[PDB]
DNA sequence: AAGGATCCAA
DNA sequence: TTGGATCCTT
DNA sequence: AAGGATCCAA
DNA sequence: TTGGATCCTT
């Protein structure tokens, strides 16, 4: 939908430059984030593990609940992330906070692709 | 709902005299079909496993599907059940035909509570 | 010799 | 943390 | 001395 | 067959 944005910057050379998964998958956190604040809120609150929080609002709950999981920092906006885990985590946090924001099966395959 | 039936053949002398899970499974899964076999059967298409098949309406569709299972021979009814199974499972099949039948959970744990 | 837990594979 | 089915006996 | 497979518990 | 977090290095 407004999806032709992250097409964007999957495209972009920024996203480009990133050689880091964890970086990828910050970037696409931080702008998914910069769509919709609301919809990315709520695409949120749904995603966690059996033990382990995964987003919050800083950095404490995070290191709280479940214990080595590397809380990076900031996105670019208002969120804290769990970041020990490998990819396919990775993925799948972004399949289920695009799924919750209504974007096309299409891009999200291709959007985890890339991760 | 018509589940007070249900609450009678777990009095029952007849429930009573079964002294293995496979009898007494096969008794509720008998009764169950004697009630609505219209609910029963949508019950059962939902029901299987990761690759067995539970219910079928032959010995031989059992079978094939999944290898030592111990089909056995009609409840009182058309199906064929496999009964190489725990009696957990014996117990979820029951939990699923019921719940599906629109039985009560105050029931259903009752009843999977006697198998 | 049937039944079913207990163990091993997804 | 579900499901298959060996394989050890309630 | 971060990243993220792997490898191990539900 | 998913989720943790060790623990070996793309």
Chains 1, 2 share one sequence.
């Not at 956190?29 to 919809?39: I, N």
């Not at 987003?55 to 804290?80: R, S």
Request: glycine share 6%; charged share 20%; net charge neutral.
């Amino acid at each position: 939908p407004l999806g032709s944005a992250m097409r964007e910057l999957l495209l972009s050379d920024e996203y480009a430059e990133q050689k880091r998964a964890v970086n990828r998958f910050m970037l696409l956190l931080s702008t998914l984030y910069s769509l919709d604040a609301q919809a990315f809120a709520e695409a949120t609150e749904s995603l966690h593990g059996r033990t382990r929080v995964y987003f919050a609002a800083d950095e404490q709950t995070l290191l709280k609940n479940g214990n080595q999981t590397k809380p990076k920092h900031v996105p670019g906006t208002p969120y804290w992330v769990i970041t020990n885990t490998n990819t396919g985590r990775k993925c799948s946090m972004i399949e289920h906070i695009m799924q919750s924001m209504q974007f096309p099966a299409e891009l999200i395959e291709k959007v985890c692709g890339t991760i």
